């Protein structure tokens, strides 16, 4: 489905509704029908929903790189002048919500509508037709939402123990519906280690043979140890699917959805992913992920590490000041000293960040970001290149957390612009190549 | 199979439709011509072999007809 | 204000946009304090169009000069000398912020300096000649308006400058809660604000015009632009910030312009922000708003 | 020849085509796009576009 | 905003259901956390903190003496009332140390309770379900242009 | 011969136009190519490589020799037939790796003698 | 669409008819031949 | 282990415009859901008490000035937004404002008809000078929520009428909090209700409950 | 004051245990406002009787096991947590289950005291190994909501006393969602979908009306303050 601005829908379908409201007696002749639509008399809206029903439309965003840049959807009348785009098709369209625009096309003939529903329909195109990898697979927010859902926290609230001597196990629940009643009260944590009995889900392979092997668990009860979230996660997958019981990285999510395509019809994958979306969002907001100057941490070893290579640099620079050193070698040496230190600060930085920090969780889960990126935010941005394409031996010791300096900043843009200029000519040439491949 | 319940355009599922024709392309012409066939009747002449929905669009009808194996076709 | 002050390499008597290579688009070391490196178009005009810096000044011969304060024997004078790029390669430019000593002199053992490479170097207070007039010499007006500029990569800063000149005047026009220096002086020098050219007192204040009775005995009046359509369709409406009895001084601000409040540029509103992701609505750069 | 003309070096192509007195069969899909024909791929292939559809006599009976 | 952060309005909610501070004060904008970290624009988080400072006012830090961080040094800046406007010239602005010291300051909403901690975060209540959001969320005031 | 459709995950349909799909599958990522689009374009356009590198003309052991500023490679064929010489190889190109080629190594008919881009016409 | 009939079969794009005319003006003789009968007239 | 001491709702006072309300006891995990259920309804459905359109003799539309007035008509409409009024209604009723000579116009200068009142006459409208004259009538209608200005092409109004956005919201700012009642814990929630002075926190919370009671059904 | 049109309450029956309920149309944003309060009233607010504590003969200082039965200590407790019986006592009552020999015990073998009635006799409790006996006491007291196993004082003097998590309310799972109508007579109005899975004690319709009444009178505390302001019926 897609959100279609009702004003836009009205004009697109104008000849269709004009007929409809002449069929119903709203208007006596075609001339009256045309004025009725132009002035937007309120009767037309109910009529529009009629003609637009199950009548597909093509959505395109430029530039169109692969055929997935055009996909058919089911139009839904929407208030406002914008277009509502399903969050799982952004990957294929490469659609930023920074203010991108998209074109709508109305297929007319029976054949055109058939081609839309069958060939180009959104839910029938999931995997990229290049690598076969899944595209509509969750990303960004939906990653961190599920990654948080499935993660396991040592010593959370309600953790199964299990009890000894005077008490029974204490980490057990009659059903999943019970662990919910326990979670709503302060008793249970979604990330807790508890074990539960599950009638309506399917155990894994190995634990399946040992428990039943008759056999199966269509209505049957069985017990495994998992986080409450991992239970709810597996309620999103098809009932016939085995119980994964992992914390979901992006790759782990890719593994599963790749697997659903091999073992299941497309409609199943279409709906499975829709459920991953709804869940991932709900838990992305409950995830408690934000950013702050505080949540940006800097390694304390950075100072000493910094001055450690400052001496090695000034000494090797002292060897060049002595006259014996080859000028190209001294500068070249400064690259290797500083390039190396950049890793130690990266090693030192990664070591400092608690694993639950919001900045790191984003990159860990594979939702978005790099370590190289989080290395410039805190720690050091590192060496930068001159416009000549060489490496300026002067490092940027500051990070964008502490702020750069007048000269540190003037040097960065030196290269940072040359890169933004490249991105310009990289689409101009890449498109020139694609046009030759196509022909 | 339990896929839950398809909404609108996704019904009937492609997979259950693709067993009724050689390819996705054949499925297109299959349903497409049957739709042009139905619309004529409302003015070839035959069908709606299935029970029409309330307002149902002929193309949507022809897809249901194909799902129930209510028509046969011969590729060229 | 930035349209004027723009300098572009295209046009008759200059290279075409298509032919010129990336060597001219790159920032040269001599652009410092003359042409802002952080401000250019994102399109394939990058580096061909730029804005003149804040303290930059044009020479009768057409070469840009930048203000400097000459240092002698580790002491920075009040002498301010405007130098071209040729005479800047001649000397050693001390860094704008170097610790100041009492009546003034070099405090820090050594001085930050720029050579004729331009190649940066660290030498003591001994060999310097000139020093920078202040930070943000290299920066342009719009660039100088980004709070915490030093914390943002040049990529996002460029986008930030470009988008300030992309804003539209609001009916209310509230000024920025956390600003920088320039907001005050960028609005008056723009000309969209009404300034008084003689000290005096206000005789009348109407939505239509404002009259001031000078101490000079002369009588100056200013007609207010009201709901004037602008080039691209924004609104130029002005409002008086003064009252009848008010005393006023030469160069003060009598009335606000479209994007100004009380004399400083207001390009937007101050809003209460929450950085949480919310139910998949603000996603992939999207934003959600209070119906308020 | 009109596929080559639309691609690049149009004048070079048209001049060599007119001298060689070239005849274009209009088999390729770009050619069919230009003239508004059905591209010979996907649903435009003969085997698919010539499909004939009728309801089964069994189906017509149930009506 | 001035930092290159841009986006379309994707939704506008009734003031009833929005993240709202303990005061019952709804937030005007909800910005996604994910776009911020990778774009190197983090200056937008700083001014989000300062924005809260400038809006709610603050005090020292004195007596007895002036704390270590203020020594380099805010001058006459030790106290500003609520709603006062701030200026941080680009290449000499406020500095990270000076932010934290200000981040704790100052009540009230009206009642003497404080709505933001020294981390620039607050507990928002979902205006939809009415229950709080499990973790402390960053709030503040940002300058955004149309 | 074509095999599975990456989209369907099954044998390609008979209508599929796989050239266009190939063209797009190749060009789309080109935006992400920063040893780049120039090299790719070099390959698809079949131009002689930027720095040509020689390939073995025949099978045999290799005699290496270093001149001033140059390299000489001679292949003694297992025939053993006419010796095959590669005259001036700028030392800037170094050599390919098995490690790095050394005097006495055996070479098969197609092997690349030096780091670089073999002339596709030659191969 | 206004009569709810089937959408008809497409015709010749006017731009193509224009192209033939522009090639003729270069003294390029461009004939559209059927299987036969040889030359077809755009009109 | 049924514990029944029927819920107790006791009022309070903080200021005149707002008052705290407290309800105890309640089963564990309630006040949040129960508090927000009132807040959502308070910030929306309390009726008003808002001004629909306005007519100013001199001006035919919103975008001009008035002779001698310091504020343009559009910046005056903004000010009139802050009007907090209340009306017995029903049906529309016009107010009237006329002021001459220098001075400052405020909501007190608005003469309400019989059956309406202006609860913040202290409010600044426009500042006039010797030449300034302001003659404007205002139409107060009754409703709830926020209704955007109804354009007179949709209504039956003529070229003179200036439609304005209308906020009917007696309530100003609302919050809540809960404190359990250790094992046996119950929940007691306090809600902090503030109003614009068009109604008392008591009458609004009564409105919410009354509006909230009628809704639950089965 | 208020008149509006129009809400209606309908129900789709998924199973004798389960039902779906939908209200249409609401006024935005009333979906979020009420519906979360409804999930609470049904879950925590409805009176029902459940097991509180249990003690088995032969289990005192042993950690987990029961010679003569394949079910261990933990498996039987959660086996018993599913026991649904409505008790009229208002005070804790001790039922008794005593069985021996090879066989499978069920909720029918337990002899309820007068006033407590077991609603799921076929319920499985334990499998008795050849030549074995099982003795268990069950403490059943009325309540509401979900009260985790209480050790207060704590379990204390009683040796072999096992407190158990008590599911007091009949409804074991509930959830809600929000969707929008309509054809643009009402545009973007809220529709509330509530999903109720119920224990055999009461039906979904009974648990809904129970929530309706407990919530309605609940808000009477506010309406009593004035009653002046009102809304549509
Ligand atoms: Mg974009």
From Swiss-Prot, chain B:
<keyword id="KW-0548">Nucleotidyltransferase</keyword>
<protein>
    <recommendedName>
        <fullName>DNA-directed RNA polymerase subunit omega</fullName>
        <ecNumber>2.7.7.6</ecNumber>
    </recommendedName>
</protein>
<keyword id="KW-0804">Transcription</keyword>
<comment type="function">
    <text>Promotes RNA polymerase assembly. Latches the N- and C-terminal regions of the beta' subunit thereby facilitating its interaction with the beta and alpha subunits.</text>
</comment>
<comment type="subunit">
    <text>The RNAP catalytic core consists of 2 alpha, 1 beta, 1 beta' and 1 omega subunit. When a sigma factor is associated with the core the holoenzyme is formed, which can initiate transcription.</text>
</comment>
<dbReference type="GO" id="GO:0003899">
    <property type="term" value="F:DNA-directed RNA polymerase activity"/>
</dbReference>
<keyword id="KW-0240">DNA-directed RNA polymerase</keyword>
<comment type="similarity">
    <text>Belongs to the RNA polymerase subunit omega family.</text>
</comment>
<dbReference type="GO" id="GO:0006351">
    <property type="term" value="P:DNA-templated transcription"/>
</dbReference>
<dbReference type="GO" id="GO:0000428">
    <property type="term" value="C:DNA-directed RNA polymerase complex"/>
</dbReference>
<keyword id="KW-0808">Transferase</keyword>
<dbReference type="GO" id="GO:0003677">
    <property type="term" value="F:DNA binding"/>
</dbReference>
From Swiss-Prot, chain C:
<comment type="similarity">
    <text>Belongs to the RNA polymerase beta chain family.</text>
</comment>
<protein>
    <recommendedName>
        <fullName>DNA-directed RNA polymerase subunit beta</fullName>
    </recommendedName>
</protein>
<comment type="subunit">
    <text>The RNAP catalytic core consists of 2 alpha, 1 beta, 1 beta' and 1 omega subunit. When a sigma factor is associated with the core the holoenzyme is formed, which can initiate transcription. Interacts with RbpA, which partially restores Rif-inhibited transcription.</text>
</comment>
<comment type="function">
    <text>DNA-dependent RNA polymerase catalyzes the transcription of DNA into RNA using the four ribonucleoside triphosphates as substrates. This subunit often mutates to generate rifampicin (Rif) resistance. Interaction with RbpA partially restores Rif-inhibited transcription; once the subunit is Rif-resistant however RbpA no longer stimulates transcription.</text>
</comment>
Curated annotation (Swiss-Prot), chain F:
<comment type="function">
    <text>DNA-dependent RNA polymerase catalyzes the transcription of DNA into RNA using the four ribonucleoside triphosphates as substrates.</text>
</comment>
<comment type="subunit">
    <text>The RNAP catalytic core consists of 2 alpha, 1 beta, 1 beta' and 1 omega subunit. When a sigma factor is associated with the core the holoenzyme is formed, which can initiate transcription.</text>
</comment>
<protein>
    <recommendedName>
        <fullName>DNA-directed RNA polymerase subunit beta'</fullName>
    </recommendedName>
</protein>
<feature type="binding site">
    <location>
        <position position="1"/>
    </location>
    <ligand>
        <name>Zn(2+) 2</name>
    </ligand>
</feature>
<comment type="similarity">
    <text>Belongs to the RNA polymerase beta' chain family.</text>
</comment>
Curated annotation (Swiss-Prot), chain H:
<dbReference type="GO" id="GO:0003899">
    <property type="term" value="F:DNA-directed RNA polymerase activity"/>
</dbReference>
<dbReference type="GO" id="GO:0003677">
    <property type="term" value="F:DNA binding"/>
</dbReference>
<comment type="similarity">
    <text>Belongs to the RNA polymerase alpha chain family.</text>
</comment>
<dbReference type="GO" id="GO:0006351">
    <property type="term" value="P:DNA-templated transcription"/>
</dbReference>
<dbReference type="GO" id="GO:0046983">
    <property type="term" value="F:protein dimerization activity"/>
</dbReference>
<comment type="subunit">
    <text>Homodimer. The RNAP catalytic core consists of 2 alpha, 1 beta, 1 beta' and 1 omega subunit. When a sigma factor is associated with the core the holoenzyme is formed, which can initiate transcription.</text>
</comment>
<keyword id="KW-0548">Nucleotidyltransferase</keyword>
<dbReference type="GO" id="GO:0005737">
    <property type="term" value="C:cytoplasm"/>
</dbReference>
<dbReference type="GO" id="GO:0000428">
    <property type="term" value="C:DNA-directed RNA polymerase complex"/>
</dbReference>
<keyword id="KW-0240">DNA-directed RNA polymerase</keyword>
<keyword id="KW-0804">Transcription</keyword>
<protein>
    <recommendedName>
        <fullName>DNA-directed RNA polymerase subunit alpha</fullName>
        <ecNumber>2.7.7.6</ecNumber>
    </recommendedName>
</protein>
């Amino acid at each position: 489905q897609c959100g279609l601005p009702k004003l836009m829908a009205l004009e697109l379908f104008k000849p269709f509704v004009m007929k409809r409201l002449v069929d119903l007696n709203h208007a006596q002749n075609i001339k009256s029908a045309k004025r009725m639509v132009e002035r937007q008399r309120p009767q037309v809206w109910d009529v529009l929903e009629e003609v637009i029903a199950e009548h597909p439309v093509l959505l395109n965003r430029a530039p169109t790189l692969h055929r997935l840049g055009i996909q058919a959807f089911e139009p839904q009348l929407v208030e406002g002048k914008a277009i509502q785009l399903h969050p799982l098709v952004c990957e294929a369209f490469n659609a930023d919500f920074d203010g991108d625009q998209m074109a709508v096309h109305l297929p007319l003939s029976a054949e055109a509508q058939a081609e839309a529903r069958i060939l180009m329909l959104s839910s029938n195109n999931i995997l990229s037709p290049a690598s076969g990898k899944p595209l509509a697979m969750p990303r960004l927010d939906m990653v961190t939402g599920l990654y948080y859902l499935t993660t396991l926290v040592e010593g959370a609230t309600g953790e199964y123990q299990a009890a000894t001597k005077d008490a029974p196990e204490q980490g057990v629940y009659s059903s999943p519906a019970e662990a919910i009643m326990a979670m709503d009260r302060g008793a249970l944590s979604v990330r807790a280690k508890i074990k539960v009995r599950l009638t309506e889900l399917r155990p894994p392979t190995d634990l399946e043979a040992q428990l039943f092997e008759n056999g199966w668990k269509p209505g049957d009860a069985w017990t495994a140890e998992t986080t409450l979230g991992r239970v709810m996660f597996n309620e999103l997958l098809p009932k016939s699917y085995p119980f994964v019981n992992e914390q979901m990285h992006k790759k782990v999510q890719a593994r599963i959805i790749n697997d659903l395509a091999e073992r299941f019809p497309m409609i199943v994958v279409a709906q499975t992913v829709d459920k991953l979306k709804d869940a991932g969002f709900y838990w992305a907001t409950r995830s408690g992920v934000t950013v702050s100057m505080a949540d940006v941490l800097v390694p304390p070893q950075k100072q000493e590490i910094l001055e450690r290579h400052e001496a090695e640099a000034d000494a090797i620079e002292r060897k060049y000041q002595r006259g014996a050193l080859n000028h190209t070698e001294r500068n070249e040496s400064l690259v290797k000293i500083w390039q190396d230190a950049t890793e130690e600060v990266g090693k030192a930085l990664e070591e400092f960040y608690p694993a639950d920090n919001p900045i790191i969780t984003i990159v860990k889960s594979g939702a978005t970001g790099n370590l190289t990126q989080t290395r410039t935010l805190a720690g050091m941005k590192g060496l930068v290149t001159n416009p000549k394409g060489e490496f300026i031996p002067r490092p940027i010791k500051s990070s964008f957390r502490e702020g750069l300096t007048v000269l540190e900043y003037f040097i960065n843009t030196h290269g940072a612009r040359k890169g933004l200029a490249d991105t310009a000519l990289r689409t101009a040439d890449s498109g020139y190549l694609t046009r030759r491949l196509v022909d | 199979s339990a896929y839950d319940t398809p909404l609108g355009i996704t019904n009937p599922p492609i997979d259950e439709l693709l067993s009724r024709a050689s390819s996705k392309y054949a499925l297109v012409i299959y349903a497409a011509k049957r739709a042009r066939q139905i619309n004529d009747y409302y003015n070839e002449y035959v069908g709606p072999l299935v029970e029409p929905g309330l307002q149902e669009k002929p193309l949507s009808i022809a897809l249901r007809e194909i799902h129930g194996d209510l028509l046969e076709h011969t590729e060229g | 204000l930035t349209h004027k002050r723009r300098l572009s390499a295209l046009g008759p008597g200059g290279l075409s946009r298509e032919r010129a290579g990336l060597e001219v688009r790159d920032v040269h070391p001599s652009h410092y304090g003359r042409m802002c490196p952080i401000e250019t178009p994102e399109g394939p005009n990058i580096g061909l169009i730029g804005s003149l810096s804040v303290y930059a000044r044009v020479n009768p011969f057409g070469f840009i000069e930048t203000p400097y304060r000459k240092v002698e024997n580790g002491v920075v004078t009040d002498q301010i000398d405007y130098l071209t790029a040729d005479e800047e390669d001649r000397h050693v430019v001390a860094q704008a912020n170097s610790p100041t000593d009492e009546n003034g002199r070099f405090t820090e053992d050594r001085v930050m300096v720029r050579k004729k490479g331009g190649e940066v170097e660290f030498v003591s207070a001994d060999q310097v000649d000139y020093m920078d007039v202040s930070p943000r010499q290299m920066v342009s007006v719009a660039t100088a308006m980004i709070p915490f500029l030093e914390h943002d990569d040049a990529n996002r800063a460029l986008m930030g400058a470009n988008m300030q000149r992309q804003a539209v005047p609001l009916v209310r026009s509230e000024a920025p809660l956390v600003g920088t220096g320039m907001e005050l002086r960028a609005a008056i020098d723009a000309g969209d604000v009404v300034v008084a050219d003689k000290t005096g007192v206000i005789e009348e204040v109407s939505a239509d015009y404002i009259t001031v009775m000078a101490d000079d005995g002369t009588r100056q009046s200013y007609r207010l632009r009201k709901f004037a359509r602008s080039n691209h369709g924004t609104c130029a409406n002005q409002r008086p910030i003064v009252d009848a009895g008010q005393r006023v001084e030469a160069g003060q601000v009598i009335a606000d312009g479209p994007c100004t409040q009380n004399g400083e540029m207001a390009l937007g509103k101050n809003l209460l922000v929450a950085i949480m992701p919310w139910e998949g609505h603000n996603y992939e750069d999207a934003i959600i708003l209070s119906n308020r | 020849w009109l596929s080559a003309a639309s691609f690049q070096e149009t004048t070079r192509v048209l001049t060599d085509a007119a001298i060689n007195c070239r005849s274009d069969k209009l088999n390729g899909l770009k050619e069919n796009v230009i003239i508004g024909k059905l591209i010979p791929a996907g649903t435009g292939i003969s085997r698919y576009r010539n499909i004939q559809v009728q309801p089964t006599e069994e189906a017509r009976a149930a009506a | 905003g001035r930092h290159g952060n841009k986006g379309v309005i994707g939704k506008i909610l009734p003031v009833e259901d929005m993240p709202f501070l303990p005061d019952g004060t709804p937030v005007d904008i909800i910005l996604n956390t994910h776009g911020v970290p990778r774009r190197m624009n983090i200056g937008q988080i700083l001014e989000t903190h300062l924005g809260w400072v400038a809006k709610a006012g603050w005090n020292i830090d004195v007596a007895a003496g002036v704390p270590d961080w203020a020594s380099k040094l805010p001058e006459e800046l030790y106290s500003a009332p609520a709603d006062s406007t701030v200026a941080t010239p680009v290449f000499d602005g406020a500095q990270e140390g000076e932010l934290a010291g200000l981040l704790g300051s100052t009540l009230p909403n009206r009642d003497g309770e404080v709505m933001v901690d020294a981390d620039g975060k607050s507990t928002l209540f979902d205006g939809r379900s009415g229950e709080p959001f499990p973790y402390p969320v960053t709030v503040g005031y940002m300058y955004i242009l149309k | 011969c074509y095999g599975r459709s990456m989209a369907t995950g099954k044998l390609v349909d008979i209508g599929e136009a796989v050239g266009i799909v190939a063209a797009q599958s190749i060009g789309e990522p080109g935006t992400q190519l920063t040893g780049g689009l120039p090299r790719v374009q070099e390959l698809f356009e079949a131009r002689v490589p930027r720095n040509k590198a020689p390939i073995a003309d025949v099978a045999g052991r290799v005699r290496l020799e270093e001149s001033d500023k140059f390299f000489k490679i001679t292949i003694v064929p297992d025939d053993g037939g006419e010796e095959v010489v590669y005259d001036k190889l700028s030392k800037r190109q170094r050599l390919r790796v098995i490690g790095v080629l050394s005097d006495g190594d055996h070479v098969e008919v197609g092997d690349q003698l030096m780091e670089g881009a073999a002339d596709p016409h030659e191969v | 669409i206004v009569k709810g009939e089937n959408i008809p079969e497409p015709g010749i794009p006017e731009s193509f008819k224009v192209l033939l005319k522009e090639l003729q003006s270069l003294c390029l003789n461009v004939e559209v031949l059927s299987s036969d009968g040889a030359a077809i007239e755009m009109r | 282990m049924l514990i029944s001491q029927r819920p107790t709702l006791s009022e309070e006072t903080v200021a005149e415009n707002r008052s705290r309300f407290v309800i105890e006891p309640l089963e564990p995990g309630f006040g949040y859901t129960l508090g927000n259920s009132l807040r959502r309804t308070l910030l929306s459905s309390i009726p008003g008490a808002a001004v629909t359109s306005i007519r100013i003799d001199g001006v035919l539309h919103e975008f001009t000035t008035v002779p001698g007035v310091k504020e343009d008509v559009t910046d005056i409409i903004l000010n009139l937004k802050g009007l907090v009024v209340s009306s017995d209604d029903d049906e529309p009723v016009t107010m009237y404002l006329r002021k001459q000579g220098p001075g400052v116009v405020t909501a007190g200068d608005i003469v309400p008809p019989a059956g309406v009142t202006v609860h913040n006459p202290d409010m600044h409208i426009a500042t006039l000078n010797d030449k300034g004259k302001l003659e404007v009538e205002l139409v107060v209608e009754r409703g709830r929520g926020y209704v955007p200005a109804v354009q007179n092409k949709a209504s039956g109004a003529e070229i003179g009428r200036i439609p304005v956005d209308s906020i009917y919201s007696p309530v100003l700012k609302v919050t809540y909090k809960v404190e359990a009642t250790q094992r046996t814990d119950f929940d007691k929630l306090i809600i902090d209700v503030e109003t614009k002075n068009s109604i008392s926190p008591r009458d609004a919370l009564a409105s919410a409950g009354g509006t909230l009671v009628e809704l639950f059904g089965l």
